[PDB]
Amino acid sequence: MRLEFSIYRYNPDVDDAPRMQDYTLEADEGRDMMLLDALIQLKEKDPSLSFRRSCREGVCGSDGLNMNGKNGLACITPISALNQPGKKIVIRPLPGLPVIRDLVVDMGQFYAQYEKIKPYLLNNGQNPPAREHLQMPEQREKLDGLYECILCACCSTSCPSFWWNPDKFIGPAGLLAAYRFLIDSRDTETDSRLDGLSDAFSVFRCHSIMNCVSVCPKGLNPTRAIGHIKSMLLQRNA
Amino acid sequence: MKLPVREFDAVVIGAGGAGMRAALQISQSGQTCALLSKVFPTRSHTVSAQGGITVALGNTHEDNWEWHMYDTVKGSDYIGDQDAIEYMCKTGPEAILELEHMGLPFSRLDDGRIYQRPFGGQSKNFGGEQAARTAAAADRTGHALLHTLYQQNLKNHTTIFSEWYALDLVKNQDGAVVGCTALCIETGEVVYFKARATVLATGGAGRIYQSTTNAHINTGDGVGMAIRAGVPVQDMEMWQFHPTGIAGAGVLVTEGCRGEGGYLLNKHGERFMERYAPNAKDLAGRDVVARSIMIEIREGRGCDGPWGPHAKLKLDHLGKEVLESRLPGILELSRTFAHVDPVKEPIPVIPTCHYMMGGIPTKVTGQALTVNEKGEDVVVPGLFAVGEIACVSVHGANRLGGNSLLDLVVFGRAAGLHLQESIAEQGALRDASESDVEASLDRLNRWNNNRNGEDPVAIRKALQECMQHNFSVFREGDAMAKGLEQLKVIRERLKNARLDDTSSEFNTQRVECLELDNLMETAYATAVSANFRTESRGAHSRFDFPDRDDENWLCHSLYLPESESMTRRSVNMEPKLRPAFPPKIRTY
Amino acid sequence: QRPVNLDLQTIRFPITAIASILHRVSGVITFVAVGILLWLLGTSLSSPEGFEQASAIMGSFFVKFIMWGILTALAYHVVVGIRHMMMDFGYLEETFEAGKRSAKISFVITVVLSLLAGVLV
Amino acid sequence: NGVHDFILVRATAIVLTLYIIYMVGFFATSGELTYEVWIGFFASAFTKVFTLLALFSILIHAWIGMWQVLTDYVKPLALRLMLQLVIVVALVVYVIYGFVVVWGV
């Protein structure tokens, strides 16, 4: 059984601007594969096809793509969920980011905003614990839903506010992370962190569009996290 | 010099668990340090680790680091170096608590301390009752660990050269390693990273097999590079097949499944692990569980279905609540790749190639070793290794669950803790000449020039097929001597293999071809070694020599890359703080 | 210098996203509407005869349509803004389900008011 | 700062909601729209105050709102400043014209 694809191609040494390209793949009728499987096969037929991938099990965040108009990971999107009678499967780079080559985007700003919220524990060393910091299951639960993020960039690159100000608005990804250290009971700089997010762009460009939630391959919920951050900001500056 | 030179005190090749820890530590000890990685650091295989870190924290029950030292030595089937294993187990607790202070989001006991789960090969009192010493964050521990180390490398402003692919080591006219050449993936630029210390930290090589739990990027790049630089590799025949990979998919489900109370059933619904290992049962040493499952299959007691031949791993009896909290990760993996909900039905599993016990022989300090013509160890100046690419050796012929991550942190840290002394000890190294740097690019120049040669796609598939059939869980003289012949043939094809993407901007073909050379060197040394060891020990299982032979084989095997011949190395049996554990019979 | 994929036509927009781009649009419209409304109000209060003329201006079908749209934009901005504020005070859940469900209930309440605005014209 | 904006927008919106409820009220319960019932409703102190209160609300609410829109879409500094000038002047005009219309009836 045949599958057809329309895939984004661009090579700055060869192409004038980016272009779509048709691809066919003789696929095994009985079994169902994953988009990443297809991609990998297409590369044996066309070696010049560039795209990132590693864990192939949805954990690493390497292969975020816009598939049939929506962001996701190639390694865990089944061909069956994209394929429709008489349409090509359309595959294009995550939106908003510089295209380096074919399906590979420059994740620079994505990381830059991540670095901006200071994503590491900050503990002022007072009252040091004997061994590990003691954290009750009650407190530890508050990281559940936040620490699991794989930095794949699906959410941020599907957020309009991020498109328009990719260097002032932190982005769903970033703010999820920010909250992950705002409520870690072991972090002692909550106040200091919040004073860094009080301006007009870092958090407040978020308009509750909720694209972030729908695209997250790890089913996280940046919208909610952002909401908690606003609460903290009101609690503190109002 | 007609190639850009970037000089550092240390160039760490690899930003996985061990690479990031060592970088972090080298940096904080005042030296400058470049950290190279072919993927963005948090996409390293380490992210995929699930079970946890094994370490005598003594949180779930009073524990003792010697108990852990015991389990490891026995687990290694008595070819783990006991001085190193002692350093590891003894240092462990403190070295892990360090990570918690870095913010690693461990799970928690009711009283607030770090959660530890039972895991394969864990006993109190030197072989007594079942222990629970694997520290975890659900079954995403590797994810938790890697990201924390990344964050810490951010906080600490480490120089990270993300998405540079290391081509080959550079040797000076004295034969000392003085850095490496590396290809920038984004732009295509090629650079010489000049260092007084080159730390290989490139992880494993499961991709030499047809089915592996490993990421696509685990192509034993370090092994290739070491061999090509004339540096020996050790115990390469020791490949750990994890008992429970998802059948037909190869994606791993954690041993934490059996640690939390799951067990293995065969087609007859019998829990066959009680027969094969009466004491530890489903938490026996991995090599043993792996063979058990294969015997069941190989005498028609396995199951079948869409997934193919397999054993059933039953978890449903642990309940939704426990499963969703302690093992959510495998819940998703099982539903995705097996279309099986573990809350309702058992997971179809089969042993899958998982971890490379072999690697570059090193001291506890991280310094890489070679032997002189008289068989004696000498340090390779300017070259170090940590992590899976290393063979310290703390795992000998079978690694314990949760011991790998411990290894990464302990020995990564140790490499940095001891780098300054290692550099003074080796003395100033003579400069690489311009033809010294040239030589490193030989391999890459080949591919760039070869348009009309053989299809590398075909070569790779042939290679993995050969290792799968001839060097899997069970081995025999005939299989392995034939396998090896096919490899020589495959390796000839490769010297004539063609690069079909000529381009320079983010050209992933060039990378995967360069990766293929490494798959080859690794697969090859594994084959030569498995032929060489005429006994059965730990993971290595030969029908034609079914016995462990402590008279002739209580030692390490060493592949000499220039003569392509084999030799041995002593196993260390002199710990410092307790007496050795003598080799006795190993059953679970 | 480098190209980016931002071809809006090639991207799925969920209902929550549409709801919101409409809310922004409806606000910008309402901003222009106030000036138009004010001028009308000023006419209808300046004299008995200005009012008569304002009554006449409202008689035109073309004006009645513009007026209804203006009032439909305001209705929409108001309703969806309350929805937004209800999430801001925790009355509405921030799950993607509850987002879609409230967005739809907004559209219905808006159509209802849009008709009542039609009648009132 | 941004916290301030967030609150002002939402506060004004609560005032404006009540005003719309008030105005919708009158309309949907006054049948015959005679010049006389019209001017009497709009001569009442309660109607005068609420409307100026509402105009100030629009001055603030709409200005923040428009500023957000502009700083999303209009990059070049000069052009954006110009548009903000026009917008603010327009908004001030609204309140002043409101003051001319009602304090005149």
Ligand SMILES: *Cc1cc2c(cc1C)nc1c(=O)[nH]c(=O)nc-1n2C[C@H](O)[C@H](O)[C@H](O)COP(=O)(O)OP(=O)(O)OC[C@H]1O[C@@H](n2cnc3c(N)ncnc32)[C@H](O)[C@@H]1O
């Ligand atoms: C495969 C696997 C292993 C595993 C596990 C789960 C999976 C799916 N879960 C484990 C667990 O719960 N507990 C445990 O003790 N072990 C577990 N394992 C084993 C363990 O995770 C691994 O052995 C461990 O991750 C080893 O880490 P290491 O730092 O040694 O290797 P790495 O994490 O894969 O990182 C490799 C880095 O090297 C870079 N690289 C490789 N080649 C190059 C070249 N050519 N040039 C430049 N960089 C290179 C990679 O980019 C990567 O950063």
Ligand code: HEM
């Ligand atoms: C009648 C005069 C009004 C004008 C001229 C006006 C104009 C605007 C504008 C231009 C915006 C910017 C939208 C954006 O940031 O995308 C806005 C935002 C907003 N409006 Fe209004 N509006 C008016 C009345 C109201 C009323 C009565 C409400 C009742 C809730 C309201 C609720 C909101 C809310 C909650 C926001 C911000 C939500 C967000 O930032 O996403 N508005 N308004």
Ligand SMILES: O=C([O-])[C@H](O)C=C([O-])O
């Ligand atoms: O089973 C695991 O979670 C993991 O596979 C553990 C080790 O040790 O590698």
Ligand code: SF4
């Ligand atoms: S929050 Fe989810 S969608 Fe966003 S970066 Fe993380 S895994 Fe990706």
Ligand code: F3S
């Ligand atoms: S998708 Fe974007 S607008 Fe906010 S709720 Fe979301 S980050």
Ligand code: FES
């Ligand atoms: S390959 Fe790692 S998540 Fe897709």
Ligand code: NA
């Ligand atoms: Na190893």
